């Protein structure tokens, strides 16, 4: 894999190695709030993160992932548009070089400074690798980040970034509670989509929260000090690791609220 976010290997180039990039249910997308329809049949989302077991944080060259123990139902997402139980496996963010860009999904074309993706897989498929091969294999909870007041629950992440500056570095990250990354409201929009990075598999039920969380300028500034490169290689700041909105095609975005 040589894909990335540069001019020579960015989103415009991905289709040559991952043809599904021009598929029928690609993500992210722009959420047109006026066109999204309230669906009375949608259920309240059920986010059960009390028993979450975080293990490690890794810089994988495109973002940093906080990984969880998913060998048991410890942190799960259920309800909403989902049927079944989805286990949290990892979370990561996409962000910009400037506060005015960074999110993958947009709301009425508005771009947020960053976007958090809490990734969950459908337990009926047994493991994550099998789940990504299914249309309903994953449920990703997307949360927008706007720059304003600091998010207390995010500080432990910000403070460990110095230890995983470059690609391939990891650090112990146990006892991190992801509940501190959520906004107050769980109102959301939902639609069928895909992974936003290669392999771009069309296996995701996207659940995007309406309420952004606020993070401080200093917190996001630290995200921008990370590197896409490995140690001992020319420094390339890890910024603008977001894919732009893709064609909605034959899909409807549904709202859980009126
Ligand atoms: N993965 S990809 O985005 O299609 C892509 C784009 C440009 C590339 O140049 C080399 S060399 N490998 C590459 C892979
Ligand atoms: N950016 S994202 O769509 O949330 C996402 C989530 C899980 C993933 O697993 C692989 S592999 N690529 C992924 C992209
Ligand atoms: Zn993501």
Curated annotation (Swiss-Prot):
CDD domains to which the protein is assigned, alphabetical: alpha_CA_I_II_III_XIII
User: List-wise, which residues carry Phosphoserine?
Assistant: 163, 170
Task: List the cofactors.
Answer: Zn(2+); Co(2+)
Q: Which molecular function terms from Gene Ontology are attached?
A: arylesterase activity; carbonate dehydratase activity; cyanamide hydratase activity; zinc ion binding
Per UniProt, what does mutating residue 92 to Y do? In OPTB3; partial loss of activity
Stated EC number for the protein is: 4.2.1.1, 4.2.1.69
User: Outcome of altering residue 140 to F/Y?
Assistant: Strongly impaired activity
Free-text cofactor note = Zinc. Can also use cobalt(II) with lower efficiency, but not copper(II), nickel(II) and manganese(II).
The entry's stated outcome for residue 16 to E is:
In Jogjakarta
Family from the record: Belongs to the alpha-carbonic anhydrase family.
Name assigned to this protein: Carbonic anhydrase 2
Recite the lineage of the species.
Answer: Eukaryota, Metazoa, Chordata, Craniata, Vertebrata
Q: Which gene encodes it?
A: CA2
């Amino acid at each position: 894999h040589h894909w990335g976010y540069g001019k020579h290997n960015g989103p415009e180039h991905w289709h040559k190695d991952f043809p599904i990039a021009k598929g029928e249910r690609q993500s992210p997308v722009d959420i047109d709030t006026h066109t999204a329809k309230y669906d009375p049949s949608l259920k309240p989302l059920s986010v059960s993160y009390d028993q979450a077991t975080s293990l490690r944080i890794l810089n994988n060259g495109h973002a940093f992932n906080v990984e969880f123990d998913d060998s048991q139902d410890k942190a799960v997402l259920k309800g909403g548009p989902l049927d079944g139980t989805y286990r949290l496996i990892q979370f990561h963010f996409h962000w910009g070089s400037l506060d005015g860009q960074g999110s993958e999904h947009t709301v009425d074309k508005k771009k947020y400074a960053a976007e958090l993706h809490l990734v969950h897989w459908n337990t009926k498929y047994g493991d994550f690798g099998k789940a990504v091969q299914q249309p309903d294999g994953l449920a990703v909870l997307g949360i927008f980040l706007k720059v304003g007041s600091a998010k207390p629950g995010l500080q432990k992440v910000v403070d460990v970034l110095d230890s995983i500056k470059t690609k391939g570095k990891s650090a112990d990250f146990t006892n991190f509670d992801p509940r501190g990354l959520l906004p107050e409201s769980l109102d959301y929009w939902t639609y069928p989509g895909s992974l936003t990075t290669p392999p771009l598999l069309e296996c995701v039920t996207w659940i995007v929260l309406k309420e952004p969380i606020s993070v401080s300028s200093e917190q996001v500034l630290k995200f921008r000090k990370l590197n896409f490169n490995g140690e001992g290689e020319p420094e390339e700041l890890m910024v603008d690791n977001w894919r732009p909105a893709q064609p909605l095609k034959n899909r409807q975005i549904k709202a859980s609220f009126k």
